[model samples]
Target: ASVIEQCQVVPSPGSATELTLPLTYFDHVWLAFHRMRRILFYKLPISRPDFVQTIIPTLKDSLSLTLKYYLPLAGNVACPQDWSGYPELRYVTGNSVSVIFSESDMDFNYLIGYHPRNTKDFYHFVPQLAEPKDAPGVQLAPVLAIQVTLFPNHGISIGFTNHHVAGDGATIVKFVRAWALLNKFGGDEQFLANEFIPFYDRSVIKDPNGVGMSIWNEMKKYKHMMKMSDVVTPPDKVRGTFIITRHDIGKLKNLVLTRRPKLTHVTSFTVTCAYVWTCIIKSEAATGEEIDENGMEFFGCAADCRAQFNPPLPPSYFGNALVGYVARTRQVDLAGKEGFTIAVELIGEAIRKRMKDEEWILSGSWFKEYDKVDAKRSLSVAGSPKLDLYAADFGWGRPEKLEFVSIDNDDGISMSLSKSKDSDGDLEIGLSLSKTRMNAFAAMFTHGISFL
Candidate 1:
């Protein structure tokens, strides 16, 4: 088992301060999102020389500075018993976030590689988000917790777990890049660009659909539910990271274009997801389980509506600025040989409709669709390649590999831009499934790509 060497709370570097950041209606939608965990591994050319002396201090200092700018990250949610309104972020004076510094005996090379690995191994590196134990009535839980694990003489991995309602993946990326910039350049004013400054104005997010009440009501049901704080043994699952090369992405785009010539706006993302969706369904088919011909196969696409909103929001606008599209198809259609083409058409048309009818987002129709989704047959996606998570260069270099550990708990997929030096257009897809299915999926995934 890995050992924790030290655990300390790193507070905001500035003087005493207290604040209550209000949540937007958009933020209320994520009350049940729980904790999102992400890990970025860096493989240095040399061993753990100067890691404790230089690397640890630099990270701690930059994190302090980073929190000084994004203080809500270091705070906790103030949820009233009534659950009357949205939770507000409360940052009391002297509040701090804990960072666990640990050393692991696990092999560095295998964990970061693009291959099948045990899902449980990744859980060890991330810090746990514990809900207060003795709080009889109300509960105040930390929004963020971090861990830095050093594989001595090999590489280092930084792990982060944050309350999802505090912000979305884009917000996390912005925060990480800002910290990375400071850590790399030592507080250079030039690196602190206007884009890097987080915008906390909740007024920009208007909920005309009155969907806040619906979301709040849904969250109220789980108000008393307790979440596990410690890292428990994960289920009998295996994890794998698959890379869809740039050339293959182009091939997929062309294939989709060839299938649907009339679709002029088919994007690389649409084609890429369509291909993977088809592959996943086929892999499931290989397990010998009879498919319910009438059953529905869902593709829960995570859409970033920052630019699609009425008054286009700045990329810096923090908090949850996301909307999702649930694409549904019959099992028979999805499991067919033309499944890829059908998926391409379905996803492309959905994205096109959303682009033109952005008002539907606030029209209540989206939530209606969500309510009708069958979770058992769905494969949802979290994160996006556009977020460019690999760009975080904390003085060492860009991340050699990045993984979203939270996705393991869901029947979902994690997507990000591949970290390969030569191919920025490549996409990395992370999957977690039962050992038997994962092995089957890997064989189907590699063999399917060969045919493409």
Candidate 2:
């Protein structure tokens, strides 16, 4: 059986403390959203004792140390009853983040290798987040939950689930790296000082348009609506990771340049994202016979606003500093022969025009348009390819695989830098979709790339 007893690991008693932090306007925008979860697995032939005596202890101790620096992660999220204020992180004494230690008998190789996987099979490997119930006065849930699943003699996997409002991808990634570095260096104080101390100053963000209040008023209406734990409902869905080599990206970039040689902003990202968007439209069109070729299709991408702000906030300034920019095009245009060029042009224009300006977030008008986005006809990205996810190392070695578990719930594709020894300088796209659509997408993604 792949099941085992689960247990919770509390922060070291010495590190426990009481604290409360009001959610920033940016955090409130993502309130009630599902947690961001990632599972990193390592292939080691070490026994259970070696793992328990070494890896487990190191990770737990490092986590405790890491939590001492970020107490809000071990806290709970509380929303006021009257919706009078934005939600806040409350960490009282005795508050502890839960960690599940389980064992799986499944083939760890097949799970990590380049193969399609049953999306349902990945759920049990990670600890579930505490979801809000419909009961009266039940207004809080844990901000983080982790699971370390052992595959016996095969390997070990570490999974983490943290609420979106608690922090953004950059915040969590910084925390994970800190934890790993602490484990690697035996928790040296100098290393901690030099490395990952986060900046929690929310005052740096200016919201002249009162966008936070507008977002809060909008989300407060559905505060009572029980948040669903999982978004991928069907069991027939499959999760697959596809790699796009840097060479392929360069080729796509050149195609854009060849078509619009005068355009100076046609970057690799602009072309790559455009190609993916066009593929999505074409793949969906293949599956449906009477698709609306004239209908509008949306492509939304998230950009880090830290460096784009007026004064340029520190890269280490924690929490969400991301803004999403969306572009629209006709289905027929995107599915056409020159679709890649069209996508490149539209995406490049959106980035150059909207993302170039720091005031995009403060304008507060995008929220209304984002609310009307049809999920079925739109493709949003969860992460950027720029994030080197494989860099997390805990003394043993770098992760053999980094799975984006939240992709199942987000219904959006995840992007990450590839570190596969066989395929360096490549980007990986993790996707979760219905079996049929997934199969079509895989074909379109692979075969369609050759033309560019």
Candidate 3:
């Protein structure tokens, strides 16, 4: 059926040194990883032979060099002692990451387009990492896997999937950018000392109450659901994107400020997510089925503690330096006409409270109660719009389009800032839901934006 493709391990260029990244409470919040998956496209009109012979080799070599600094990417997610043990990274010399090279005839432009497309189509390109099983033996849990799918002479789409303990978006993004820079300049080491630099000092994170242990504790209680099958995104879904510009976001914010009785610092990101969350909640309403009004409807996102720490960690702390904040209410309360402002108010208040009381995040109250929420009704976010996806330039060029493939799992929206440096006002939001919900959401999302 197919020809000229293979999946191989790309270890560090030379003998890589061993790494012991002691993942603290920050990284132990869940037995389940963020399980981040993304597909990035680049426009390069090189022939298939040229791609296989030249571009593929170049990417592998650059990736190896990049991993030289990011030794943890090829790491084993080891619980040295067991669930009682903290989340730790133990990567011995020669540990390697999964990198697959393949070719596809699927229409490149259409696959990368923002139109509603088959979620299963893109799944082929997104790499899946080996998950740690419940079996007793020493199972090597590698944290990252990557795939580079070439589309004839059209373009190159590079996709990667990583376990959350490997690193947060900032760390992984920084690594990818560094890899791009290195590949662009012929395996240059310049990636290390520049903007893509990372800080791996774990001591910067202080937790006297053993919040990390608390994280492990919460995870252990819900460890029964930790099986890989539970996290798989069923292919019976469709995916699409919705764009919101700065003006519309500001309008949503102003509406919240003027309507809501008192506000806690209404921000663009907050309002945008609130609007999306409201539309999604309402979208489910179109089914004529009632969610248990008794249960809580939750909207949550990961909040970084890099700057919130007592001593304040580095901008590029190279591990999971984030906690989550979930704002919840009765289903009826947020399903009303004024749900946008209501969502904004609750979310804003949650954020404001968290900002003022940083220690509250360490109380273990967050993940301890996470599994209690109704999964079908609640949504949590993964990506942030702060990073410019268009800025990552491999030797060919910047990515023509981007998609967070993992959103298909119904984890929630994947937000990212778009535009190749022309303006900073636009954002690309990717989502995947059942066909009916997708239809309802498509209308509500678009019509509401126009109404503003």
Count of steric clashes across candidates, in order? 0, 0, 1
Model 1 TM-score, all chains together: 0.91
So what's the TM-score on candidate 3?
0.89
Give the C-alpha miss distance for residue 16 in model 3, angstroms.
Answer: 4.9
Local distance difference test, each candidate = 0.74, 0.73, 0.73
Better of 1 and 3 by lDDT: 1
Off by over 4 Å in 2: 1-16, 131-138, 193-195, 225-234, 364-369, 411-424
Model 1 lDDT tens row, 360-387: 7677545435667777778777767677
Residue by residue across 160-267, what tens digits does model 3's lDDT show?
888776778778888888888888888767545556767776877777777666556556666545543224464777788778887888788778767875876688
- RMSD of candidates 1 onward, in order: 2.7, 2.8, 3.1
lDDT, model 3, position 368: 45
Q: Rank by TM-score, highest first.
A: 1, 2, 3
Ranking by lDDT: 1, 2, 3
Model 2 lDDT, full chain set: 0.73
**Ten-residue region with minimum lDDT total, candidate 3:** 413-422
Q: Identify the runs in model 3 with alpha carbons over 4 angstroms from their true place.
A: 1-16, 80-84, 130-137, 191-193, 217-225, 228-233, 290-295, 363-367, 411-423
